[PDB]
Structure formats: C-alpha cells, structure tokens
Amino acid sequence: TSVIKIAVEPVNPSELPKMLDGLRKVNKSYPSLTTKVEESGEHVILGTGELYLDCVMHDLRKMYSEIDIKVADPVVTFCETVVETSSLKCFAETPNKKNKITMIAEPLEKGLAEDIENEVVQITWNRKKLGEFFQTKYDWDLLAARSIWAFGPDATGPNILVDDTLPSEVDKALLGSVKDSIVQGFQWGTREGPLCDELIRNVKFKILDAVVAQEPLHRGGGQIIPTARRVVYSAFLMATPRL
Amino acid sequence: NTQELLDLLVKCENKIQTRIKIGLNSKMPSRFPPVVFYTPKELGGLGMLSMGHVLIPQSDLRWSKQTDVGITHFRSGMSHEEDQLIPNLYRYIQPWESEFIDSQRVWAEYA
Amino acid sequence: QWENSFVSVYSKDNPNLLFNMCGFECRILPKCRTSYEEFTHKDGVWNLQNEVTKER
Amino acid sequence: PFDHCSLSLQPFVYPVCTPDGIVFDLLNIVPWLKKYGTNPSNGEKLDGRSLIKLNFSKNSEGKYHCPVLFTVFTNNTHIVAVRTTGNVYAYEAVEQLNIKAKNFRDLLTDEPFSRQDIITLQDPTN
Amino acid sequence: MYNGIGLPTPRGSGTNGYVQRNLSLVPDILDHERKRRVELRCLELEEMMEEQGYEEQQIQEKVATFRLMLLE
Amino acid sequence: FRRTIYLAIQSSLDFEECAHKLLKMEFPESQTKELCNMILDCCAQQRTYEKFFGLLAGRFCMLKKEYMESFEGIFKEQYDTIHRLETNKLRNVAKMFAHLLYTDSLPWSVLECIKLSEETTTSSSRIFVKIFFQELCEYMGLPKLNARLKDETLQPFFEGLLPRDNPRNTRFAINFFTSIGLGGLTDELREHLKNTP
Amino acid sequence: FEPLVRDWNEFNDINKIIIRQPIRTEYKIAFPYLYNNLPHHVHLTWYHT
C-alpha cells in the first residue's frame, strides 16, 4: 500500500518544465512511485517508505534534473467512511427537474469489503453467483443480492450501490435505462470523496426512490450524474462523516 | 522583548572586558575572573555594571520568523566562573508602564 | 519621500497597527479583533485602557 | 480573479465574456465600444456581435459555481464555457463527460454542441 | 541535539554557545423499505411454498395471502 | 535558601528565566510551600507592584499542586495578617492576589474567607478588597466579572460577600459595592432584599 | 564544525501543518534528502547490519 505524501516544488518556478522532465524520468524508472499534478496546482508524489522516498529524491536531485527544489514534510493519503446509517434522506433532482433520486448510506462490514479487495467477490460472475456468495457467507438477502448494482470507485472499490424499491424497481425500462449513468455518478462520488478528496471505503448506499422522467432522454442522460453524486454526498454527509 | 539587543549587549560587554585584558597583556580566562570587573570601586575593583550574564531565550528558527511561538531553549550569556549568579541592571530599573501609573496616582493625590 | 516614510493600514484584513516613534517600534492589537488568545506576559506589552469605560 | 471585470478590474453583476477568454462587463464594455471601439484585453478593435452572454451557476450560497458538478467556481477551479447553449459547466465536467464519450451535446440542456464551441474562460493551469 | 537551536558556530560570539532546555517549561424511508419488507414477504413465501410445492398455484396461493393479509 | 532565591530572582530577566534557574538548582521537596510564600514575601517588599513575582509563584503553582493549596493558605494568611502592613504593601498585596485570581491561579472559591459584615471587616480588609475588585474588573472587563460573581456554583463562597441572610451587613456590604462603584452587583442584590420583606 | 557556506515559503505555512511528532536533527541526518532542502556535499550513511 502506497501511503506517503510528498509535495515538491522548484525554488524558482522558472525551471518547472525541467522539474517535470525529472519527475517523468523517475516515474518511468520506478514501478509504483505515483506522481500527480494536484488541483492546488502542486506536484505530489505518493510512495512507500522513508528509505524509498529518500533514494527517490537522491536520484531526482542527483541525476535526472539538477535544479534546486523545495520539499514539504511527509503526510498521509486519507480515507473516508461512516459509522451508522443515514437516518434521513436528501434526494437530488436533475438540473432540468426531471429525475428525483432518493438514496441513503450506512456502513458495510469490513470482511466483505476485504473480499471486494481480494477479488473473491468478482461480479464478473452472474448475479446468481453473487447471491450464492453473499447469502452463503454473511446472511445477506437474496433480494439484496438482486439489488446490488455495483461497487463504486473502480474495479475493486469497497463500497456498494444497491437498488431496493420493488414497485418502482420493476420499472426496468427506465431504471435499466439509467443504471449506467447511475454507476458513473456513484463511482464519481466514491472516488472523489465527499469531505477531503480522498477515497471512501466500506460503505453501503441503497436507492429507495427513483422517480424517473418518462423517456429519460438526453435531458436525464446528461444532467443525471452530478445529481447522482449529490445523492451520494447527501446520504453520507447527512448522517455520519468519519476519517 | 528585543532578542537582538540581548545579543548585542552580550557581545559588546565582553568586547569591553577583552579590551581591558588586552590592556594588561593576556586574555587568559583564569587570570581575570568576574570578581575583578564587577567588584565595586570601593573594594578596588573596576565597577562594571552588567547585562550580559542573562540566558538568551531561543525558539525554533522557522516558526520564530512566522508566528511568535514561545521559548523552548536558553542559550547562555557571558561565561561566569561558577554558578555565581551575577545581577542585572534591568531588575533595578523600573518599567515605564508602572511609573506612569504611579505618577498618575501620586500627583492626583497631591492635588 | 516614499522611501523614508512608512504607512500602515488597519482594516478587516490587518488587525495590527504598527508605527515607529521616538525610538520605539510599537504595534497595537485590540482585543475585539483577532485576539481569541490573550495573555498578560513579559513587560514589553503595555495594556492600554479606555478611559471612559475603564476596561482594557 | 474569477468573476470581476477586467477594464474596471472590478466586479461584474452581469457578465459578457470575450470570445477570447476574459470577462468584459457588458454594461461598461458597451461604453468602451461606444466611446472607443477597441478592446482592453487587446488594444485592437473587435466586432460587436461576438460579445455573447455567460451563465455562472449559483448554489444555496449564491456563489457563481458550476451547475453540473455543483462545484464552487473560484480562482483555482478550471472553468470552460459552452457558447451555443448559453451555459458554462466546469471544464473538468465537460471534458470527462464529452471528451471521453462522443456525445458532444450541451452541459445543462438536451442540446448538441460543436467540438470547438467550448472555450476556457478561467484556468489557473494554462 | 542541534534542533534548530543555538549558534552555527560559537566562534566569534563571546559565549561558548552552550544550549539547554528551559527547565521551567510547563418520509419515504419507512414506506420505501416497507415495500422491501413486502418484498421478501412475497419472495420467501413463494420460496417456502416452492420448498413445500412448486405448482405455482399453491405458491401463488401462499403469496397472495402473504401480500393481502400483511398489507391490511 | 532565601539568599539564593533572592539572587536567582535578581539575576534573571523574567519569570521564565528565573523559574528555569530555580528548577535547575535543586532543593529538598520540603520547602515548596515556602517557595511560594517566599516569592510572596519578596514582591510584598518590592518598590511597587510588578506582576513578575505573581507570574513566578503562579507558574510554580501551575507546575505542581503544592503551591496551589499553598496559595490557598497564602491568601488565607494574608487575610489573617493583612492589617500588618502599610497601605503601600497592602496595595501590592491586593494587586498580587488579583493577578492570581484573574489568571485563575487562585480559585474563586477562596472568597469564603471574606465576610462582608461591618464589624467583621477591618478597614484594612475594606481597602484590600477595594483595590482587589477594581483590579479584577479593570482587568477582566466588568461583564464577565458580573457573570462569574453571579454563577451559583461559587455563591457558597460568595455569600460572605453578598449578604441577603443578614440584612444589616446586607445594607453595609451593598453600600461598599456601591462605594467601589459596581452598581450592577449592588442593585441586583438589594433588589432581592427589596423583594424580601 | 564551522558552517560550510554561511524570505517567504508556503510549505512552512503554520495553518497547513500537522505536528504530531516534532522533527529533530537525528531525522534530518538519517534521511538527508527527505528531511532537508538544498542538501549539498552530503554522504548518505545507513546500516542495517
């Protein structure tokens, strides 16, 4: 797990393109040293350990680029989560007021998120296998397994977007229309974090009210995703942030 | 409150002492303990008044030029022969802000 | 001349008013403004007092 | 900064951006063109019908955010604009939602868009 | 430890530069999930019916009461 | 001892450096209370009040409880032997305890030893508490002075100062709060005494 | 030894830092390049013998 955070700058901003050449060369010469040009305008590096980062900057200042460069102090990359279920709802409706989405949030258990990380629950299965896995091990509902749509951040993200509101759920025309954008916005909110722009982990969101504009056309199709992630944030921030 | 004076006064006081040593012909630190400089002039000494035997309070350069951090360490002032505790002129002078209140009350009640 | 002079503003961004008189270098900071934290400490700090209400 | 005029270098209550990228507060840019037809961003005179209006969204705080992402737009956030629709959605929003896909439509409405109709109006990384 | 305290060099300073530390320092929510209660109420009923017979009329019997007798 | 203490004091520049010098010498743990009472003695005999000595013995109190309870007794004892000085010494004494109080080094509890009856109050005590409370209000501002002098959790101590029980010393002590000019406290409690009969 | 050679910064902003354990010269010498800007004429000595 790469966890250490190091921001770097040249002393005179003039030679920043050369500093960029150097950060290229280290990124190419190192396996998992990961650099990012962060929205604050900065250049952050994410790494493993003290000796690791030491020899990193040793080569950076020694060989690749010979500018003088300032270096901030080490810090961590963070995670976000909840402690208990979103006791109420804020529900987001598209810019053109066409789709009302009610969803809430709560905590999963650690183990199943661990399995999500283990690739043990690979949804590359059929929903049937999903159900076997889930109900078998952790007394999940079979219908909860039917309700699990996806996993958030990326291929392996420890949170789960679930859809459980039966009579409006059998609107498989409009919902089975909207699942794609729904998942886009979900993984959006999960990756970009509701509080501090770091990853969320091990959290369960449940869709309980999908009032879809009939023919959820490009109006929905386009103006649906920020609405979805705002639903995500509403649930989370409403009833219980945690670090 | 000026941490740059305190250093100025240490260095300047000990330059004056050193010119007296150089006036005799040696700077050995044990030929000239403090006693010969600070003894009053009745007992034959020279009669110096000192402010360089204080401890100079030191604090964390970086945040010292940033946000008034406090006092963590104490550099030493001039070097005195033992513990020896040499007094201070500042403690025998009386601050202004307190003289201004005295004078307030004193002339009020004389009026 | 602007080179030998010195101007100091107090506003909603500067809570300190700095000036430089007979030989002293002074800086006034009110209590209402950004002093959540106040001490009474070494003497370098005169505690000015408002002579109508008599409160510092 | 973000939402202030440039010739006045003061705030604009109603904006009209330049087809080049800055904020030309129409109320005084029309005085500037009706008294000396040139532009302050570029001392060369520039035609009239190019000064289109702009849409800076607003939250429960009223701040000139981006509507799509709900992202408050200040001097750090990258802001693109869509000319033909009349709406401005955040540059990152428009980029990852249309420069990944091939639906080059509008960012607030159901309208298509032209692959060059989006111009950078505010970007501290440029 | 030279912890950013002291002199660079106590050479031309008139002191030995010795340092020390200051010793005196110190509303749909229930209704949305009610249909979810009603959900498995129809599901497992026809399951516990198919466990005891899957003619789909014996189980549509079991579900309809589990739907109507509950929703009353 | 007192020689070495007076000399560390008179050789330092502020209570920080003096406290460092004292703790860097060492003594037996026996004389802690008299450490505090000694800084007391020295300031009492000073030219004029300067919060040096206050801040110093108060810092000792901050560094251990010995001087906290020691100062419980120290205030007690200056209330016992406060007539013993002249007006000058008594002024610095009152300003001393006042610095203690608004720095909260002494607890506002100690007011129990302050019985505001006429016949119990030496004129010396009267002037002492006069300068004391003027220092408190002109230090803290009057509002939170009224607020804390109001909160009931301390009224057990404060009773001796604010008489409702005995009406004679009610008249007297409220007239004294009138005297020092804290009309708020004065008229609030003689309001209650208005309502009483 | 005598020192070898002889305004504003943002990383030193005191509002953005978290001091959970305070840096010391032992760290600044253990990791010369991580814990020090402009580390010049430096030997990086380490031993896990």
PDB file of C-alpha atoms in Angstrom, chain A residues 8-200:
ATOM      1  CA  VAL A   8       7.704  19.130  -4.289  1.00  0.00           C
ATOM      2  CA  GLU A   9       8.466  22.450  -5.964  1.00  0.00           C
ATOM      3  CA  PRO A  10      11.379  24.136  -7.719  1.00  0.00           C
ATOM      4  CA  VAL A  11      12.854  27.099  -5.903  1.00  0.00           C
ATOM      5  CA  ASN A  12      12.378  29.402  -8.888  1.00  0.00           C
ATOM      6  CA  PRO A  13       9.151  28.498 -10.715  1.00  0.00           C
ATOM      7  CA  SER A  14      11.015  29.170 -13.963  1.00  0.00           C
ATOM      8  CA  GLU A  15      12.571  25.700 -14.254  1.00  0.00           C
ATOM      9  CA  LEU A  16       9.332  23.822 -13.547  1.00  0.00           C
ATOM     10  CA  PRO A  17       9.292  22.191 -17.025  1.00  0.00           C
ATOM     11  CA  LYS A  18      12.734  20.754 -16.292  1.00  0.00           C
ATOM     12  CA  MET A  19      11.471  19.590 -12.905  1.00  0.00           C
ATOM     13  CA  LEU A  20       8.659  17.963 -14.885  1.00  0.00           C
ATOM     14  CA  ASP A  21      11.199  16.202 -17.100  1.00  0.00           C
ATOM     15  CA  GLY A  22      12.789  14.867 -13.934  1.00  0.00           C
ATOM     16  CA  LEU A  23       9.507  13.660 -12.463  1.00  0.00           C
ATOM     17  CA  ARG A  24       8.800  11.896 -15.740  1.00  0.00           C
ATOM     18  CA  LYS A  25      12.120  10.093 -15.613  1.00  0.00           C
ATOM     19  CA  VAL A  26      11.608   8.946 -12.021  1.00  0.00           C
ATOM     20  CA  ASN A  27       8.042   7.809 -12.754  1.00  0.00           C
ATOM     21  CA  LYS A  28       9.348   5.721 -15.639  1.00  0.00           C
ATOM     22  CA  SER A  29      12.282   4.315 -13.688  1.00  0.00           C
ATOM     23  CA  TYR A  30      10.183   3.413 -10.656  1.00  0.00           C
ATOM     24  CA  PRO A  31       7.384   0.818 -10.506  1.00  0.00           C
ATOM     25  CA  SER A  32       4.770   2.315  -8.193  1.00  0.00           C
ATOM     26  CA  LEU A  33       6.094   5.747  -7.306  1.00  0.00           C
ATOM     27  CA  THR A  34       2.977   7.622  -8.352  1.00  0.00           C
ATOM     28  CA  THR A  35       3.004  11.333  -9.152  1.00  0.00           C
ATOM     29  CA  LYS A  36       0.033  13.636  -9.609  1.00  0.00           C
ATOM     30  CA  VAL A  37      -0.340  17.298 -10.503  1.00  0.00           C
ATOM     31  CA  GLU A  38      -2.846  18.188  -7.834  1.00  0.00           C
ATOM     32  CA  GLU A  39      -5.722  20.664  -8.256  1.00  0.00           C
ATOM     33  CA  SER A  40      -3.987  23.003  -5.840  1.00  0.00           C
ATOM     34  CA  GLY A  41      -1.512  23.337  -8.707  1.00  0.00           C
ATOM     35  CA  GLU A  42       1.133  21.287  -6.928  1.00  0.00           C
ATOM     36  CA  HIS A  43       3.204  18.198  -7.676  1.00  0.00           C
ATOM     37  CA  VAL A  44       2.561  15.444  -5.142  1.00  0.00           C
ATOM     38  CA  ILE A  45       4.281  12.072  -5.004  1.00  0.00           C
ATOM     39  CA  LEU A  46       2.735   9.031  -3.341  1.00  0.00           C
ATOM     40  CA  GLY A  47       5.175   6.423  -2.104  1.00  0.00           C
ATOM     41  CA  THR A  48       6.017   3.581   0.261  1.00  0.00           C
ATOM     42  CA  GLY A  49       8.616   4.365   2.903  1.00  0.00           C
ATOM     43  CA  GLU A  50      11.301   6.658   4.193  1.00  0.00           C
ATOM     44  CA  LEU A  51      14.202   4.874   2.506  1.00  0.00           C
ATOM     45  CA  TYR A  52      12.111   4.656  -0.659  1.00  0.00           C
ATOM     46  CA  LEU A  53      11.433   8.393  -0.854  1.00  0.00           C
ATOM     47  CA  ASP A  54      14.987   9.149   0.219  1.00  0.00           C
ATOM     48  CA  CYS A  55      16.577   7.342  -2.709  1.00  0.00           C
ATOM     49  CA  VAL A  56      13.815   8.758  -4.908  1.00  0.00           C
ATOM     50  CA  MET A  57      14.888  12.321  -4.251  1.00  0.00           C
ATOM     51  CA  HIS A  58      18.525  11.247  -4.252  1.00  0.00           C
ATOM     52  CA  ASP A  59      18.210  10.295  -7.905  1.00  0.00           C
ATOM     53  CA  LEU A  60      15.892  13.206  -8.659  1.00  0.00           C
ATOM     54  CA  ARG A  61      18.340  15.846  -7.456  1.00  0.00           C
ATOM     55  CA  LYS A  62      21.462  13.873  -8.387  1.00  0.00           C
ATOM     56  CA  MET A  63      20.861  12.663 -11.944  1.00  0.00           C
ATOM     57  CA  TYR A  64      17.577  13.480 -13.634  1.00  0.00           C
ATOM     58  CA  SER A  65      17.347  17.243 -13.036  1.00  0.00           C
ATOM     59  CA  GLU A  66      19.829  19.467 -11.204  1.00  0.00           C
ATOM     60  CA  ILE A  67      17.617  22.385 -10.169  1.00  0.00           C
ATOM     61  CA  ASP A  68      17.259  23.363  -6.532  1.00  0.00           C
ATOM     62  CA  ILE A  69      13.897  22.086  -5.325  1.00  0.00           C
ATOM     63  CA  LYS A  70      11.950  22.573  -2.104  1.00  0.00           C
ATOM     64  CA  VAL A  71      10.259  19.625  -0.428  1.00  0.00           C
ATOM     65  CA  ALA A  72       7.400  19.626   2.033  1.00  0.00           C
ATOM     66  CA  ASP A  73       7.057  17.365   5.036  1.00  0.00           C
ATOM     67  CA  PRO A  74       5.638  13.844   4.714  1.00  0.00           C
ATOM     68  CA  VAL A  75       1.947  13.265   5.339  1.00  0.00           C
ATOM     69  CA  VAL A  76      -0.581  10.548   4.590  1.00  0.00           C
ATOM     70  CA  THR A  77      -3.219   9.964   1.962  1.00  0.00           C
ATOM     71  CA  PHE A  78      -6.512   9.603   3.768  1.00  0.00           C
ATOM     72  CA  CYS A  79      -9.706   7.556   3.729  1.00  0.00           C
ATOM     73  CA  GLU A  80     -13.311   8.493   4.484  1.00  0.00           C
ATOM     74  CA  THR A  81     -16.193   6.479   5.907  1.00  0.00           C
ATOM     75  CA  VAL A  82     -19.325   6.448   8.066  1.00  0.00           C
ATOM     76  CA  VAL A  83     -20.271   4.886  11.413  1.00  0.00           C
ATOM     77  CA  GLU A  84     -24.060   4.405  11.187  1.00  0.00           C
ATOM     78  CA  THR A  85     -26.918   4.594   8.738  1.00  0.00           C
ATOM     79  CA  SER A  86     -28.154   7.755   7.044  1.00  0.00           C
ATOM     80  CA  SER A  87     -31.195   8.326   9.271  1.00  0.00           C
ATOM     81  CA  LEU A  88     -32.939  10.517   6.683  1.00  0.00           C
ATOM     82  CA  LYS A  89     -32.828  11.485   3.022  1.00  0.00           C
ATOM     83  CA  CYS A  90     -31.831  14.413   0.899  1.00  0.00           C
ATOM     84  CA  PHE A  91     -32.803  13.482  -2.639  1.00  0.00           C
ATOM     85  CA  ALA A  92     -31.384  15.083  -5.779  1.00  0.00           C
ATOM     86  CA  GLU A  93     -33.331  16.010  -8.924  1.00  0.00           C
ATOM     87  CA  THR A  94     -31.750  16.768 -12.288  1.00  0.00           C
ATOM     88  CA  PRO A  95     -30.954  20.387 -13.317  1.00  0.00           C
ATOM     89  CA  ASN A  96     -33.915  20.191 -15.585  1.00  0.00           C
ATOM     90  CA  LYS A  97     -36.157  18.934 -12.794  1.00  0.00           C
ATOM     91  CA  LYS A  98     -36.768  15.554 -14.407  1.00  0.00           C
ATOM     92  CA  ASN A  99     -35.328  12.812 -12.173  1.00  0.00           C
ATOM     93  CA  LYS A 100     -35.717  12.562  -8.389  1.00  0.00           C
ATOM     94  CA  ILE A 101     -33.243  10.146  -6.792  1.00  0.00           C
ATOM     95  CA  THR A 102     -33.600   9.117  -3.131  1.00  0.00           C
ATOM     96  CA  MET A 103     -30.747   7.020  -1.741  1.00  0.00           C
ATOM     97  CA  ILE A 104     -29.247   6.597   1.734  1.00  0.00           C
ATOM     98  CA  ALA A 105     -25.961   5.369   3.190  1.00  0.00           C
ATOM     99  CA  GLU A 106     -24.754   3.110   6.002  1.00  0.00           C
ATOM    100  CA  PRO A 107     -21.695   1.002   6.886  1.00  0.00           C
ATOM    101  CA  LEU A 108     -20.929  -2.421   5.477  1.00  0.00           C
ATOM    102  CA  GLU A 109     -18.876  -4.938   7.400  1.00  0.00           C
ATOM    103  CA  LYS A 110     -15.113  -4.989   6.935  1.00  0.00           C
ATOM    104  CA  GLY A 111     -14.808  -8.607   5.773  1.00  0.00           C
ATOM    105  CA  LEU A 112     -16.944  -8.316   2.638  1.00  0.00           C
ATOM    106  CA  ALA A 113     -15.127  -5.153   1.555  1.00  0.00           C
ATOM    107  CA  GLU A 114     -11.961  -7.140   2.176  1.00  0.00           C
ATOM    108  CA  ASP A 115     -13.282  -9.752  -0.249  1.00  0.00           C
ATOM    109  CA  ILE A 116     -14.029  -6.972  -2.751  1.00  0.00           C
ATOM    110  CA  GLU A 117     -10.341  -6.134  -2.364  1.00  0.00           C
ATOM    111  CA  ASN A 118      -9.409  -9.844  -2.588  1.00  0.00           C
ATOM    112  CA  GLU A 119     -11.161 -10.200  -5.979  1.00  0.00           C
ATOM    113  CA  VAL A 120     -13.040 -13.025  -4.259  1.00  0.00           C
ATOM    114  CA  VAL A 121     -16.459 -11.500  -4.991  1.00  0.00           C
ATOM    115  CA  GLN A 122     -15.698 -10.699  -8.631  1.00  0.00           C
ATOM    116  CA  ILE A 123     -19.043  -9.622 -10.070  1.00  0.00           C
ATOM    117  CA  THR A 124     -17.763 -10.881 -13.434  1.00  0.00           C
ATOM    118  CA  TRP A 125     -19.927 -13.739 -12.205  1.00  0.00           C
ATOM    119  CA  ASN A 126     -23.643 -13.796 -12.804  1.00  0.00           C
ATOM    120  CA  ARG A 127     -25.946 -12.234 -10.222  1.00  0.00           C
ATOM    121  CA  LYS A 128     -26.766 -15.833  -9.283  1.00  0.00           C
ATOM    122  CA  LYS A 129     -23.169 -16.428  -8.172  1.00  0.00           C
ATOM    123  CA  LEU A 130     -23.258 -13.033  -6.481  1.00  0.00           C
ATOM    124  CA  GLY A 131     -26.217 -14.278  -4.480  1.00  0.00           C
ATOM    125  CA  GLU A 132     -24.616 -17.606  -3.587  1.00  0.00           C
ATOM    126  CA  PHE A 133     -21.515 -15.809  -2.306  1.00  0.00           C
ATOM    127  CA  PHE A 134     -23.372 -13.163  -0.348  1.00  0.00           C
ATOM    128  CA  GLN A 135     -26.248 -15.066   1.264  1.00  0.00           C
ATOM    129  CA  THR A 136     -23.981 -18.047   1.903  1.00  0.00           C
ATOM    130  CA  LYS A 137     -21.358 -16.191   3.863  1.00  0.00           C
ATOM    131  CA  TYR A 138     -22.757 -13.108   5.610  1.00  0.00           C
ATOM    132  CA  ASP A 139     -26.548 -13.585   5.830  1.00  0.00           C
ATOM    133  CA  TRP A 140     -27.065 -11.095   3.011  1.00  0.00           C
ATOM    134  CA  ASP A 141     -30.512 -11.125   1.460  1.00  0.00           C
ATOM    135  CA  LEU A 142     -31.018 -12.910  -1.823  1.00  0.00           C
ATOM    136  CA  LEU A 143     -33.013  -9.854  -2.868  1.00  0.00           C
ATOM    137  CA  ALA A 144     -30.205  -7.674  -1.509  1.00  0.00           C
ATOM    138  CA  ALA A 145     -28.003  -9.604  -3.930  1.00  0.00           C
ATOM    139  CA  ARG A 146     -30.565  -8.899  -6.657  1.00  0.00           C
ATOM    140  CA  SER A 147     -30.377  -5.247  -5.554  1.00  0.00           C
ATOM    141  CA  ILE A 148     -26.579  -4.921  -5.661  1.00  0.00           C
ATOM    142  CA  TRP A 149     -25.843  -2.951  -8.797  1.00  0.00           C
ATOM    143  CA  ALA A 150     -22.165  -2.123  -8.429  1.00  0.00           C
ATOM    144  CA  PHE A 151     -19.083  -1.359  -6.417  1.00  0.00           C
ATOM    145  CA  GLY A 152     -18.095   2.301  -6.782  1.00  0.00           C
ATOM    146  CA  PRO A 153     -14.561   3.587  -7.018  1.00  0.00           C
ATOM    147  CA  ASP A 154     -13.205   1.264  -9.704  1.00  0.00           C
ATOM    148  CA  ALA A 155     -12.718  -2.449 -10.454  1.00  0.00           C
ATOM    149  CA  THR A 156     -12.238  -3.082  -6.735  1.00  0.00           C
ATOM    150  CA  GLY A 157     -13.924  -0.495  -4.549  1.00  0.00           C
ATOM    151  CA  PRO A 158     -15.149  -1.491  -1.111  1.00  0.00           C
ATOM    152  CA  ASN A 159     -18.471   0.358  -1.299  1.00  0.00           C
ATOM    153  CA  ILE A 160     -21.713  -0.910  -2.828  1.00  0.00           C
ATOM    154  CA  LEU A 161     -24.558   0.760  -4.733  1.00  0.00           C
ATOM    155  CA  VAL A 162     -27.760  -1.258  -4.227  1.00  0.00           C
ATOM    156  CA  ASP A 163     -31.266  -0.716  -5.676  1.00  0.00           C
ATOM    157  CA  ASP A 164     -34.215  -1.782  -3.458  1.00  0.00           C
ATOM    158  CA  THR A 165     -37.701  -0.256  -4.033  1.00  0.00           C
ATOM    159  CA  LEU A 166     -39.807  -3.022  -5.523  1.00  0.00           C
ATOM    160  CA  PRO A 167     -42.805  -1.496  -7.366  1.00  0.00           C
ATOM    161  CA  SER A 168     -40.815   1.375  -8.838  1.00  0.00           C
ATOM    162  CA  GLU A 169     -37.905  -1.087  -9.110  1.00  0.00           C
ATOM    163  CA  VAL A 170     -39.773  -3.174 -11.700  1.00  0.00           C
ATOM    164  CA  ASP A 171     -39.569  -0.056 -13.879  1.00  0.00           C
ATOM    165  CA  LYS A 172     -36.700  -1.925 -15.555  1.00  0.00           C
ATOM    166  CA  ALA A 173     -37.419   0.155 -18.676  1.00  0.00           C
ATOM    167  CA  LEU A 174     -36.442   3.464 -17.069  1.00  0.00           C
ATOM    168  CA  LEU A 175     -34.118   2.108 -14.385  1.00  0.00           C
ATOM    169  CA  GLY A 176     -32.448  -0.418 -16.724  1.00  0.00           C
ATOM    170  CA  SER A 177     -32.134   2.687 -18.845  1.00  0.00           C
ATOM    171  CA  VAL A 178     -30.490   4.723 -16.074  1.00  0.00           C
ATOM    172  CA  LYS A 179     -28.164   2.187 -14.382  1.00  0.00           C
ATOM    173  CA  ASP A 180     -25.156   3.240 -16.471  1.00  0.00           C
ATOM    174  CA  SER A 181     -25.170   6.931 -15.575  1.00  0.00           C
ATOM    175  CA  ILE A 182     -26.160   5.957 -12.045  1.00  0.00           C
ATOM    176  CA  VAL A 183     -22.968   3.946 -11.716  1.00  0.00           C
ATOM    177  CA  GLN A 184     -20.911   6.704 -13.310  1.00  0.00           C
ATOM    178  CA  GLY A 185     -22.095   9.178 -10.677  1.00  0.00           C
ATOM    179  CA  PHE A 186     -21.711   6.641  -7.878  1.00  0.00           C
ATOM    180  CA  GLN A 187     -18.102   5.782  -8.663  1.00  0.00           C
ATOM    181  CA  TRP A 188     -17.595   9.518  -9.155  1.00  0.00           C
ATOM    182  CA  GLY A 189     -18.621  10.391  -5.613  1.00  0.00           C
ATOM    183  CA  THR A 190     -16.799   7.401  -4.141  1.00  0.00           C
ATOM    184  CA  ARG A 191     -13.500   8.206  -5.845  1.00  0.00           C
ATOM    185  CA  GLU A 192     -13.528  11.983  -5.348  1.00  0.00           C
ATOM    186  CA  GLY A 193     -14.603  11.797  -1.716  1.00  0.00           C
ATOM    187  CA  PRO A 194     -17.322  13.818  -0.048  1.00  0.00           C
ATOM    188  CA  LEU A 195     -15.114  15.567   2.513  1.00  0.00           C
ATOM    189  CA  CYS A 196     -11.385  15.680   1.745  1.00  0.00           C
ATOM    190  CA  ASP A 197     -10.944  14.382  -1.834  1.00  0.00           C
ATOM    191  CA  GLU A 198      -9.572  11.021  -0.662  1.00  0.00           C
ATOM    192  CA  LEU A 199     -11.087   7.596  -1.166  1.00  0.00           C
ATOM    193  CA  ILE A 200     -14.108   6.318   0.732  1.00  0.00           C
TER     194      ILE A 200
END
